[PDB]
Structure formats: structure tokens, C-alpha cells
Amino acid sequence: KPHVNIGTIGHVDHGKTTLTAAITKTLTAHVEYETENRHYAHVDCPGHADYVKNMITGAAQMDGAILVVSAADGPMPQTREHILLARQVGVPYIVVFLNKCDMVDDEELLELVEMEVRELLSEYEFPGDDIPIIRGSALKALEGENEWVDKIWELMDAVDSYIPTPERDVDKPFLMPVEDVFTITGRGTVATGRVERGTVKVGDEVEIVGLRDTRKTVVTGVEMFRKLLDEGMAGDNVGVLLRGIQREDVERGQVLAKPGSIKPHTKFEAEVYVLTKEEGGRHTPFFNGYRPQFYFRTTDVTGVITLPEGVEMVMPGDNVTMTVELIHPIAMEEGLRFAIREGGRTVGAGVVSKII
């Protein structure tokens, strides 16, 4: 049965931890649980920076989120912050659990809160008019009341049907980041790496994207050492041979890809979290014009940072939306994670939020 990564977002005390427990009983504290047609991994962080860092750099990468909103309070500023963040890091779908409905029985009051949640979701670019809003009480559900346990079921039905099962890596357009390039004596040039997505077979055309102008060629070999010939797929460590390609023609940090499926860019917006000293970062802040290294897949490229209008610095442990201009193009899409390094220290973790 398919697996999906999700979690709970929304303002402090609105009920994420209780909902999380009520869901598990019915049917960064990780839990797993399953529905009839799907298995779930579920994250519930204890507030503040924990959400920021799981969402920018976490073990999972959320395929959808449950926004918890307390009927008693309405949307608060962390409700907004979390919706904004979700958009920034690429969370593809949101279902809402309107919680604490045991405390608010005026239907008219519930519809007010509902209207405002939808508007707030639509003010980022989520489709506020189509997102499921399930009325409930995680507390009364956890406490066994059949009335409210039923709505945990309704929530999980809405999760099953509205948050699609993510596209499997093997079904995506071929992509292999080039790890190294060398000549095998008596043979020729190979480009090695671990296939990230899709499938490749001898005779396929690929593009070599990033660092230099894109070129297209044909795959003349795919090898997994002493195990496999002619094909590879997501997860495989392979050497790829390419028609007409010498060592001067392919390098570490480029990618092999299905033609047209990914483009090179030098300029993008990203959401970045600045590591603390204790996390391995520096104690000093980011600033406009800072020119660290950006690590995207298998290479690192210098880039210049610009901070938002009227932000002069960003302190360790904080996050911001930054604009970046790289000195060389790199293959990239929205939602791609990267590290920011300077010297031998990881100073930042990012996700590409928009391509310019």
C-alpha cells in the first residue's frame, strides 16, 4: 500500500500534538500509521525553529500538510507563517483540520473561521476554495467520543483522497548528477553517478546540463560494475558512456537528463536557514553581497546573496528569503535543496523557491 509523508502545521496550542495522537489511536516526533489504502509517516515538531528546519532540511520532505486551526482562536500569526513556509519549500497540498469545535458550536462562528482560513490559504497560492476543511475535536476524539472519532476518520478520508501519492522516482524524467568522469583503459570515457530519477537505456538521448552550454548526445553504455549492462534506474550507481564525449566534454556537477526536462539557471530565490555555531555554522550573520559556495547535488558554485529590501543581516538560527546569483549555471528546479558552505563549514541550508 503506498507511503506518504505528511505532518501537522499551524499555530502553537491549536492542537497538532493532540491531533497527531488522536489520529494514531483512531486507525520532530515521528509516527507512522495507516489508512485502508495508504501508509503514512507523520511529523509533529514542538514549535518555532523545528518547523523551519524540518521544512528546509528534514529527513522526509512533506508530500502534504495538515494545517490545524483552532475554531476558538481563528488563524493566528504562526498559521500564516506556516502557510507561507509551505509555499516557500514546495509542500504540494494542504488539508485543514478545524480543531476545538467542541468549544465552538455556533455554526455562524465556524463559517467565519472557515472563510478566513480559505482566504489566508489563497493569499499564498494554495487553492483556498478547494481545500478540504474538516471540523473536529482532537481532544474529544482522543478521549473516545464516537462523534469526534468519526471526524478523524473524515480527516483521514480527505487526506487519502485529496493529497495525491507522490510520483515515484522511477517515473520521473531521467536525471543523474555526474559524480566523476574518467577514462577506463582500453575503453573510453565514463561519467559516473547515482541515478536520482527515472530510467536510462543504451540508445537514449540525454542532455548534459549545467556549468556550460547544454549539449545533447546518445547513451552508448550503462554499467553497474560486474552486475548490469544496458540500463539503469533511480538508485543505481552506474558508469555511463556517451557518444563523442571526452573528459573535456562532461564534468562533475553537470547532470545527465532527459532532453528538455531540466534547464540551467544562475539566478533564483530561495528560502534559507542559517546554521548556528552549535550546528556547525558560523556565529556571524549573512549580509548583502556575501559570496559563499552553493552545493547543488555534486558540485559547488560561488554565488552572491541579496537579502530582502531593508534587511542588512540574517543571524544564525534565523531564516529568510534570499536572492542568489551564481557565477556558473547549474541545473535546478523549484523545490531543489542545497547547502551553503564557506571554508569547511556548512553555514546555510536552502531550498529553491523560485527561478528568475
Query: Strand locations in 21-153, DSSP E?
Result: 29-34, 39-44, 64-70, 94-99, 133-135
With CB under 5 to 8 Å by kind, the binding choice for 36 among Mg ion, its own copies, ligand GDP, none is none
The nearest distance, CB 191 to ligand GDP, in angstroms, is 22
Q: Which region among 8-16, 231-239, 267-275, 285-293 touches ligand GDP (by CB under 6 A)? A: 8-16
Q: How far is CA 245 from the centre of its chain?
A: 33
d(C-alpha 1, C-alpha 31), whole Å: 17
Q: Does position 180 bind its own copies by CB under 8 A? A: yes
Distance between CA atoms of residues 136 and 186, nearest Å: 69
Residues 87-126 that bind ligand GDP (CB under 6 A): 99-100, 102-103
Residue nearest to Mg ion as judged by C-beta position: 17
Report whether 278 contacts 320 (CB < 8 A). Answer: no
CB-nearer residue toward ligand GDP: 100 or 258? 100
Task: Based on the residue annotation, tell me whether 217 is a catalytic residue of this protein.
Answer: no
Q: Which of 14, 16, 100, 265 is catalytic?
A: 16
The option from ligand GDP, Mg ion, its own copies, none interacting with 18 (CB < 5 to 8 A, set by class) reads ligand GDP
CA–CA dist 36, 151 (Å, integer): 16
Residues 337, 295: Cα–Cα separation, whole Å: 9
Q: State the binding string over 212-251 for its own copies (x if CB under 8 A, else -).
A: -------------xx----------x-x------------
How would you write 231-277 as a 3-class SS string?
EEECCCEEEEEECCCCHHHCCECEEEECCCCCCEEEEEEEEEEECCC
161 near its own copies, judged by CB under 8 A: no
Active site residue 16: yes
Minimum CB distance to its own copies smaller for 135 or for 297 = 297
d(CA 330, CA 267): 10
Kindly state the smallest distance separating residue 75's Cβ from ligand GDP, in Å.
Answer: 13
Interface with its own copies (CB under 8 A), residue from 12, 47, 182, 235:
182
Per-residue x/- track, 15-54, Mg ion (CB under 5 A) = -xx-------------------------------------
**Pick from ligand GDP, its own copies, Mg ion, none: which does 78 bind, CB < 5 to 8 A by kind?**
none
Nearer residue to ligand GDP within complex by CB, 102 or 204 = 102
Cα–Cα dist 216/209, whole Å = 9
Contact 211, 253 (CB under 8 A): yes
φ, ψ for residue 45, nearest 5 deg: -90, 150
Q: What count of other Cβ atoms lies within 10 Å of the Cβ of residue 332?
A: 24
CB atoms near residue 309 (< 10 Å):
5
The yes-or-no answer on residue 165 being catalytic is no
CA distance linking residue 325 with residue 140, whole number of Å: 51
| Contact call for residue 265 and ligand GDP (CB under 6 A) | no
179 binds its own copies (CB under 8 A): yes
CB neighbours of residue 127 within 10 Å: 11
163-202 residues near ligand GDP, rule: CB under 6 A: none
Binding partner of 225, given Mg ion, ligand GDP, its own copies, none, CB within 5-8 angstroms per partner class: its own copies
Reply yes or no on whether 140 is catalytic. no
Q: Which amino acid is at 139?
A: L
Q: Among residues 3, 30, 39, 48, which one is catalytic?
A: 48
* Partner whose binding site includes residue 184, from ligand GDP, its own copies, Mg ion, none (CB under 5 to 8 Å by kind): its own copies
**Among the candidate windows 11-19, 53-61, 248-256, 283-291, which touches Mg ion by CB under 5 A?**
11-19
138, 146, 17: which is closest to 72 by C-alpha?
138
Catalytic residues, by residue number, are: 13, 16-17, 48
Site residues for ligand GDP per CB under 6 A: 12-18, 68, 99-100, 102-103, 137-140
